[PDB]
Structure formats: structure tokens, C-alpha cells
Design an enzyme around this catalytic site. Structure first.
Site, PDB file in Angstrom:
ATOM      1  N   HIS A  64      50.951  43.217  31.757  1.00 59.01           N
ATOM      2  CA  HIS A  64      50.830  43.604  33.165  1.00 59.01           C
ATOM      3  C   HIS A  64      51.809  42.832  34.063  1.00 59.01           C
ATOM      4  O   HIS A  64      52.204  43.328  35.095  1.00 59.01           O
ATOM      5  CB  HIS A  64      49.392  43.402  33.661  1.00 59.01           C
ATOM      6  CG  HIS A  64      48.362  44.012  32.761  1.00 59.01           C
ATOM      7  ND1 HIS A  64      48.195  45.374  32.632  1.00 59.01           N
ATOM      8  CD2 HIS A  64      47.466  43.444  31.920  1.00 59.01           C
ATOM      9  CE1 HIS A  64      47.232  45.620  31.764  1.00 59.01           C
ATOM     10  NE2 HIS A  64      46.782  44.466  31.306  1.00 59.01           N
TER      11      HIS A  64
ATOM     12  N   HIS B 271      52.194  34.233  38.762  1.00 59.03           N
ATOM     13  CA  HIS B 271      52.834  35.439  38.290  1.00 59.03           C
ATOM     14  C   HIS B 271      53.404  36.162  39.490  1.00 59.03           C
ATOM     15  O   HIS B 271      53.222  35.756  40.643  1.00 59.03           O
ATOM     16  CB  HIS B 271      51.824  36.347  37.566  1.00 59.03           C
ATOM     17  CG  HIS B 271      50.689  36.763  38.434  1.00 59.03           C
ATOM     18  ND1 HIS B 271      49.538  36.008  38.567  1.00 59.03           N
ATOM     19  CD2 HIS B 271      50.567  37.793  39.301  1.00 59.03           C
ATOM     20  CE1 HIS B 271      48.742  36.577  39.452  1.00 59.03           C
ATOM     21  NE2 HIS B 271      49.339  37.665  39.911  1.00 59.03           N
TER      22      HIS B 271
ATOM     23  N   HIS C 223      54.440  40.294  41.150  1.00 59.49           N
ATOM     24  CA  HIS C 223      54.418  41.758  41.155  1.00 59.49           C
ATOM     25  C   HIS C 223      55.736  42.194  41.754  1.00 59.49           C
ATOM     26  O   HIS C 223      56.215  41.560  42.690  1.00 59.49           O
ATOM     27  CB  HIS C 223      53.276  42.287  42.033  1.00 59.49           C
ATOM     28  CG  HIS C 223      51.942  41.737  41.657  1.00 59.49           C
ATOM     29  ND1 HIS C 223      51.083  42.397  40.807  1.00 59.49           N
ATOM     30  CD2 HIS C 223      51.344  40.557  41.961  1.00 59.49           C
ATOM     31  CE1 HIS C 223      49.999  41.667  40.634  1.00 59.49           C
ATOM     32  NE2 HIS C 223      50.138  40.542  41.311  1.00 59.49           N
TER      33      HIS C 223
ATOM     34  N   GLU D  62      52.460  43.498  47.154  1.00 57.48           N
ATOM     35  CA  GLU D  62      51.117  44.079  47.181  1.00 57.48           C
ATOM     36  C   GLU D  62      50.655  44.063  48.622  1.00 57.48           C
ATOM     37  O   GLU D  62      50.249  45.101  49.160  1.00 57.48           O
ATOM     38  CB  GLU D  62      50.202  43.251  46.268  1.00 57.48           C
ATOM     39  CG  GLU D  62      50.619  43.356  44.800  1.00 57.48           C
ATOM     40  CD  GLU D  62      49.483  43.113  43.855  1.00 57.48           C
ATOM     41  OE1 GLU D  62      48.895  41.999  43.851  1.00 57.48           O
ATOM     42  OE2 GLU D  62      49.171  44.029  43.102  1.00 57.48           O
TER      43      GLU D  62
ATOM     44  N   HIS E 237      52.238  35.194  43.264  1.00 54.47           N
ATOM     45  CA  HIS E 237      50.859  34.743  43.362  1.00 54.47           C
ATOM     46  C   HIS E 237      50.617  33.455  42.574  1.00 54.47           C
ATOM     47  O   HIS E 237      50.753  33.432  41.336  1.00 54.47           O
ATOM     48  CB  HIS E 237      49.917  35.844  42.830  1.00 54.47           C
ATOM     49  CG  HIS E 237      49.844  37.034  43.717  1.00 54.47           C
ATOM     50  ND1 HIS E 237      49.405  38.271  43.281  1.00 54.47           N
ATOM     51  CD2 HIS E 237      50.177  37.186  45.022  1.00 54.47           C
ATOM     52  CE1 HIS E 237      49.450  39.123  44.291  1.00 54.47           C
ATOM     53  NE2 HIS E 237      49.907  38.488  45.356  1.00 54.47           N
TER      54      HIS E 237
ATOM     55  N   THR F  82      43.771  41.432  42.474  1.00 63.91           N
ATOM     56  CA  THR F  82      44.403  42.731  42.680  1.00 63.91           C
ATOM     57  C   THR F  82      44.553  43.536  41.390  1.00 63.91           C
ATOM     58  O   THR F  82      45.085  44.649  41.415  1.00 63.91           O
ATOM     59  CB  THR F  82      45.753  42.624  43.381  1.00 63.91           C
ATOM     60  OG1 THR F  82      46.649  41.859  42.577  1.00 63.91           O
ATOM     61  CG2 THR F  82      45.605  41.982  44.764  1.00 63.91           C
ATOM     62  N   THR F  83      44.061  42.980  40.285  1.00 62.11           N
ATOM     63  CA  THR F  83      44.024  43.657  39.001  1.00 62.11           C
ATOM     64  C   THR F  83      42.584  43.661  38.510  1.00 62.11           C
ATOM     65  O   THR F  83      41.795  42.814  38.888  1.00 62.11           O
ATOM     66  CB  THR F  83      44.898  42.922  37.969  1.00 62.11           C
ATOM     67  OG1 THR F  83      44.442  41.571  37.864  1.00 62.11           O
ATOM     68  CG2 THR F  83      46.328  42.917  38.404  1.00 62.11           C
TER      69      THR F  83
HETATM   70  C1  LIG Z   1      46.216  40.679  34.089  1.00 64.73           C
HETATM   71  C2  LIG Z   1      45.091  40.149  34.942  1.00 64.73           C
HETATM   72  N1  LIG Z   1      45.342  39.134  35.938  1.00 64.73           N
HETATM   73  C3  LIG Z   1      44.163  38.850  36.720  1.00 64.73           C
HETATM   74  C4  LIG Z   1      43.041  38.260  35.936  1.00 64.73           C
HETATM   75  N2  LIG Z   1      42.742  36.855  35.902  1.00 64.73           N
HETATM   76  C5  LIG Z   1      41.737  36.571  34.937  1.00 64.73           C
HETATM   77  C6  LIG Z   1      40.424  37.274  35.001  1.00 64.73           C
HETATM   78  C7  LIG Z   1      39.430  36.873  33.961  1.00 64.73           C
HETATM   79  O1  LIG Z   1      38.132  36.546  34.299  1.00 64.73           O
HETATM   80  C8  LIG Z   1      37.205  37.549  34.528  1.00 64.73           C
HETATM   81  S1  LIG Z   1      43.277  35.773  37.041  1.00 64.73           S
HETATM   82  O2  LIG Z   1      42.208  35.265  37.888  1.00 64.73           O
HETATM   83  O3  LIG Z   1      44.124  34.711  36.498  1.00 64.73           O
HETATM   84  C9  LIG Z   1      44.121  36.711  38.230  1.00 64.73           C
HETATM   85  S2  LIG Z   1      44.621  36.391  39.761  1.00 64.73           S
HETATM   86  C10 LIG Z   1      45.234  37.943  40.047  1.00 64.73           C
HETATM   87  S3  LIG Z   1      45.964  38.369  41.573  1.00 64.73           S
HETATM   88  N3  LIG Z   1      47.024  39.578  41.307  1.00 64.73           N
HETATM   89  O4  LIG Z   1      46.554  37.124  42.059  1.00 64.73           O
HETATM   90  O5  LIG Z   1      44.914  38.782  42.512  1.00 64.73           O
HETATM   91  C11 LIG Z   1      45.033  38.781  38.924  1.00 64.73           C
HETATM   92  C12 LIG Z   1      44.403  38.017  37.936  1.00 64.73           C
HETATM   93 ZN   LIG Z   2      48.900  38.892  41.448  1.00 63.24          ZN
END
Ligand SMILES: CCN[C@H]1CN(CCCOC)S(=O)(=O)c2sc(S(N)(=O)=O)cc21
Ligand SMILES: [Zn+2]
EC number: 4.2.1.1
Length: 257
Positions: free
Chosen positions: A61, A91, A93, A103, A116, A195-196
């Protein structure tokens, strides 16, 4: 499984993750005229001097740079936050063209990408417990626009060939995330969500006003990544962003006039 394609993209997520239609979903459009200066907000405190990066991973992703969060090494506090939040990963986007990728949007403006920096609230003990709480995570969001190269991004850009496809990872130690910050820490803040998927409503969003600049060549390398695994048909990793969601019963606060 979920992704960003026509058949598994953001518009479909609600079928497996009904909170997709919830009350505090992210991202959102930041209407700069409606956001209110809140003088009770404190300055951000970003203490990243002891940060320890470990690894970079393509998870199908995006690509994550992961940090040792077994102690208070790299932490965020102040701002709207009570307590100490530990940096666990960052990471990005990004888009297939320079006019899209972020986003969050500002007055409906889309940036080329969005960084992020994901932090979790230490009072909850581990990351898995923190995501189940309304104040469990703090994400620092930084917009990227295309212009001059960002030197401190280059080490990230140069390893991307070794994690081209999903599931590949590479050692990534001694990376200093301070080299990704803009000059000013002025911010907007509102309560939101991942956001995922699983789209959990556990995030305090801190979005910086000032974008960082990266070069066209730097962003071009993000777009060479793959969603697919090795030996599967190639699908370029681009447009891995969720569109803006309804603000509903939320106010965006600004740290600055
Ligand atoms: C591929 C998934 N990425 C997610 C999942 N993550 C793990 C969730 C496990 O536990 C249920 S995470 O918290 O590191 C995090 S932060 C964000 S964002 N875009 O910053 O809002 C997305 C993520
Ligand atoms: Zn993110």
C-alpha cells in the site's frame, strides 16, 4: 482485498470496514477561513535526536520506514496532545501526476504527496492497544510540493529499488527524520482516523501549514514502486490516497493567526 484500484478502492472500503462512513473519518479538506485560531494550543515539541530507524518495507500500500519504539527515543508532545507519543513509523501517499497525491487538502488544493509520521500514546503500553483508543495515535502530516530537491529525503529515494515489490524489506538504520521537517511548526489539528483500513477513529491529526519541497526526480522514484508482489503482473504504486471525507461535527483548530 482492499487497495486503491477501481474494484477495491476507497469507495468500496465501507463493505468490509463500515466505520468508513463514521463520524470522525480522515482525511478532510482544511478550509483555512473556517479554521479557528486557538491560543490555548501549545507549540509542538518534536524530539527526534535519539531516533533509531530499523527497516524500510513495501507493504503493498506504501513504503514504511520503521523505528525502535521500545523506549522514549523519538517522541512528539505539546500542541493539542496530553502525554507522550512515540514515533513508530513514517510513510507517504502520492499521485500519478504532480497535481494530486495528498490526502488532506487545503482550500481544496491537492499537493503532490503527503508524509505521515505515526506516533502512539505511551500510556496505552503498546501500539495495538493504542489504536483502540480515541486518543491513541498522533499523526504528523506534512505536505510535499514539487520544486527544489529535499536533501534529507534522498537516502529514502535511493533504497526504493531494493523494495520494489510487496513484502520486500531492507535494513534502514541511522536515518534522521528531522531532515524531513519544514522550517515552521505551525499547524492545524482536528480529531480523526487512520486513512487506510481498518480506518480506526483513534487519531489526533496535526497537519503542518508549511509544505516541504521535493524534486520531480525524487517523486518520480516513488512512482516506480509496485503494489504487486514479485512475479505477479506489474501495477505501479501511484494514487495511494483516500479522498477527503465529510467534516461532520468537527472543528479544525489552528495554532497560528
Ligand atoms: C497499510 C496500513 N497502514 C495503516 C495501519 N496501521 C496499523 C494498523 C494495525 O492495527 C489495527 S498504522 O497505525 O501504522 C497506520 S497510520 C495510517 S495513516 N495513513 O497515517 O492514517 C495508516 C496506518
Ligand atoms: Zn498515511
Amino acid at each position: 482485498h482492499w487497495g486503491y484500484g477501481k474494484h477495491n478502492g476507497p469507495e468500496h472500503w465501507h463493505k468490509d470496514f463500515p466505520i468508513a462512513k463514521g463520524e470522525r473519518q480522515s482525511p478532510v479538506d482544511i478550509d483555512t477561513h473556517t479554521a479557528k485560531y486557538d491560543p490555548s494550543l501549545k507549540p509542538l515539541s518534536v524530539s527526534y535526536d535519539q531516533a533509531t530507524s530499523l527497516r524500510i518495507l513495501n507493504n503493498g500500500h506504501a513504503f514504511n520506514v520503521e523505528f525502535d519504539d521500545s523506549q522514549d527515543k523519538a517522541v512528539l508532545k505539546g500542541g493539542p496532545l496530553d502525554g507522550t507519543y512515540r514515533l513508530i513509523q513514517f510513510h507517504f501517499h502520492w499521485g500519478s501526476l504532480d497535481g494530486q497525491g495528498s490526502e488532506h487538502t487545503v482550500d481544496k488544493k491537492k499537493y503532490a504527496a503527503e508524509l505521515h509520521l505515526v506516533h502512539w500514546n505511551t500510556k496505552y503500553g503498546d501500539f495495538g492497544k493504542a489504536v483502540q483508543q480515541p486518543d491513541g495515535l498522533a499523526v504528523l502530516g506534512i505536505f510535499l510540493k514539487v520544486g527544489s530537491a529535499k536533501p534529507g529525503l534522498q537516502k529514502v529515494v535511493d533504497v526504493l529499488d531494493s523494495i520494489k515489490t510487496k513484502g520486500k524489506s531492507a535494513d534502514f538504520t541511522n536515518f534522521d527524520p528531522r531532515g524531513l521537517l519544514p522550517e515552521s511548526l505551525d499547524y492545524w489539528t482536528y480529531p480523526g482516523s487512520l486513512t487506510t483500513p481498518p480506518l480506526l477513529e483513534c487519531v489526533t491529526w496535526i497537519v503542518l501549514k508549511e509544505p516541504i519541497s521535493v524534486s520531480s526526480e525524487q517523486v518520480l522514484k516513488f512512482r516506480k514502486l509496485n503494489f504487486n508482489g514479485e512475479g505477479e503482473p506489474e501495477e505501479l504504486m501511484v494514487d495511494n490516497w483516500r479522498p477527503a471525507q465529510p467534516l461532520k461535527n468537527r472543528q479544525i483548530k489552528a495554532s497560528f493567526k
